[PDB]
Known about the structure:
Elements: E1 4-9, E2 12-18, E3 27-31, H1 42-48, E4 54-57, H2 74-88, E5 93-98, H3 102-116, E6 120-123, H4 132-142, H5 147-159, H6 165-174, H7 180-197, H8 200-205, E7 213-217, H9 223-235, E8 239-243, H10 251-254, H11 256-271
Parallel strand pairs: 3-4, 3-5, 5-6, 6-7, 7-8
Antiparallel strand pairs: 1-2, 2-4
Helix pairs in contact: 1-11, 2-3, 4-5, 4-7
Amino acid sequence: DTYLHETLVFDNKLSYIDNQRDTDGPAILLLPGWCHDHRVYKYLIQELDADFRVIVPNWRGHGLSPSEVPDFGYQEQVKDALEILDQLGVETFLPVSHSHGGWVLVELLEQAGPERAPRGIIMDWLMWAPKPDFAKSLTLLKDPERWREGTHGLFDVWLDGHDEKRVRHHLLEEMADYGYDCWGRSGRVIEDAYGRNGSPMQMMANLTKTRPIRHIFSQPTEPEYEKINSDFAEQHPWFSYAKLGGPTAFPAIDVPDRAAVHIREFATAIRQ
Length: 272
Ligand SMILES: CC(=O)Nc1ccccc1C(=O)O
Ligand SMILES: [K+]
Ligand SMILES: [K+]
Ligand SMILES: [K+]
């Protein structure tokens, strides 16, 4: 796409979207999850393109040409993300994560500090620790034998019974070139992130400087998930949530207009 660039980040060539929009801060930093790239954000980029600078970093061995790379985790994702922003001369940015991109976003808030990264939006990120099926998925992903079966179970959960053409295209075509090197790693990093931090919510409550964060999600759809968000929201003045009511675990693809309005509201609030 017309905004895709490549640059050496430390000892690694990384692709990134940068629309290089000459405009008032903050920059909007869209953070992919594991084993997909900027392609997940092509519709959200269209929504924001005119009014904001939009950067989408790809992770090591992520992008149009996936590749085996040495082991890394979310701490390196943060460093990779900041180096691209430093190279681009970006100061203030509003990070927005998809799913387990959320580990990068929260660590980026701690490392960048509340001046550089005053707020955050986490999209469709499992707020509780894995329930048995998701734990079984991560186990399958780490298995050199059963990793594809791992991704197949996840694709079933993410689509949640929906013939969602754009999301199916993302999973079965735009992720098709990712292999066991990425998927095994994702499974190790997510497993370890939960083990170490306990949960997304524990990690966010544990920031030195708490800041406005909104969780915008469509999945899971059960009332009991809406409750752990409502209970966390009552406990933490800085945490809010919106249920977007989209079909899939990919609101950036299937309700981009809705993702955009929340990102805009947080951007507008930083500009004041
Ligand atoms: C593309 C994507 O959502 N990444 C994942 C890969 C493995 C396990 C979980 C996820 C996730 O972030 O939901
Ligand atoms: K449909
Ligand atoms: K609140
Ligand atoms: K959705």
